[PDB]
Design a protein around this ligand. Structure first.
Ligand SMILES: [Zn+2]
Length: 149
C-alpha cells in the first residue's frame, strides 16, 4: 500500500462527502517549494475549505494527504464530485517529474484504481481549459505503466 503522510488540517467550510469517484485527474502546482499546509492556505484564500487535491506528491516522492479520501475536493470544477485530484510539485511546462514523483504517481494511482474500480485517467487540461499539468507531465508513460488505453 503506498505510504500516505497524514496532515493535520483545519477545514474552513463544511466538507461534502457526496463523492463518488470514477476518475483520477492529474495536476501540477506551478509553484515549487510548497508544503501541503501552504497549498491549504492558498486554497482557503480562494474560498475553498482547504487544500483541494486529495493527494500532493512532492519532488522527493513524499505523498501527502489533502482532502479526505471520501470527501469532494476543489481541484477540477465540473468533475469534483466524481474525480480524485492528484497534484505533483512543479511546473511541468519547464521541468520534468522526478523519478521519485513517477514512482509515487504509479503506486498511488494503482492503489486508487484498484480500491475504487477506476479506469479513467485524465489530465486537468482534458476536463477544463488550462495548461495544467504542464507540457512535460508524463501522462502517456503513466497510462502505459498502469496498462490503461
Ligand atoms: Zn490543475
Amino acid at each position: 500500500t503506498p505510504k500516505i503522510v497524514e496532515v493535520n488540517y483545519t477545514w474552513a467550510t463544511p466538507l461534502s462527502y457526496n463523492f463518488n469517484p470514477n476518475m483520477i485527474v492529474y495536476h501540477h502546482t506551478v509553484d515549487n517549494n510548497m508544503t501541503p499546509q501552504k497549498i491549504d492556505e492558498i486554497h482557503k484564500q480562494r474560498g475553498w475549505s482547504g487544500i483541494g487535491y486529495h493527494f500532493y506528491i512532492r519532488k522527493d516522492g513524499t505523498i501527502y494527504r489533502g482532502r479526505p479520501e471520501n470527501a469532494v475536493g476543489s481541484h477540477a470544477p465540473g468533475v469534483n464530485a466524481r474525480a480524485f485530484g492528484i497534484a505533483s510539485e512543479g511546473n511541468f511546462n519547464e521541468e520534468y517529474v522526478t523519478p521519485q514523483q513517477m514512482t509515487s504517481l504509479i503506486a498511488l494511482s494503482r492503489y486508487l484504481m484498484n480500491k475504487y474500480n477506476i479506469t479513467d485517467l485524465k489530465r486537468h487540461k482534458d476536463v477544463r481549459q488550462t495548461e495544467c499539468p504542464g507540457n512535460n507531465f508524463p501522462f502517456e508513460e503513466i497510462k502505459a505503466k498502469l496498462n490503461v488505453k
